[PDB]
Amino acid sequence: DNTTVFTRILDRLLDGYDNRLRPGLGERVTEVKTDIFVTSFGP
């Protein structure tokens, strides 16, 4: 049963997680690194 451990991991990650708050709301600035791969430059 190697599927229950990853379920417990994913449930502990989401236990008390508030997705209305950016990471580091009171201490630092959230720094997002962006990337674009153009698969097709349309008409």
Binding site: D18, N19, L21
Partner: protein, 78 residues
């Protein structure tokens, strides 16, 4: 942290079906616009396109919290 506590305390006993001052007074809403562009004004269908950032602001006495932070800046999640 503390912002989660503030957000959870604001939404307890909250009814989003009732405007603020539901039986007291009308709510005053201040509106602002920022026109990004006014699109093509075609006369065939008698219309014109516009792209705006529509901003509204009002007072809700239920979303009042006491803390050392002054403003909660949120996503579209709430």
């Amino acid at each position: 942290g503390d912002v989660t506590v503030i957000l959870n305390n604001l939404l307890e006993g909250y009814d989003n079906k009732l405007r603020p001052d539901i039986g007291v007074k009308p709510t005053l809403i201040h509106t602002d616009m920022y026109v990004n562009s006014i699109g093509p004004v075609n006369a065939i269908n008698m219309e014109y396109t516009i792209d705006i950032f529509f901003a509204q602001t009002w007072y809700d006495r239920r979303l009042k919290f006491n803390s050392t932070i002054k403003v909660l800046r949120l996503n579209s999640n709430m």
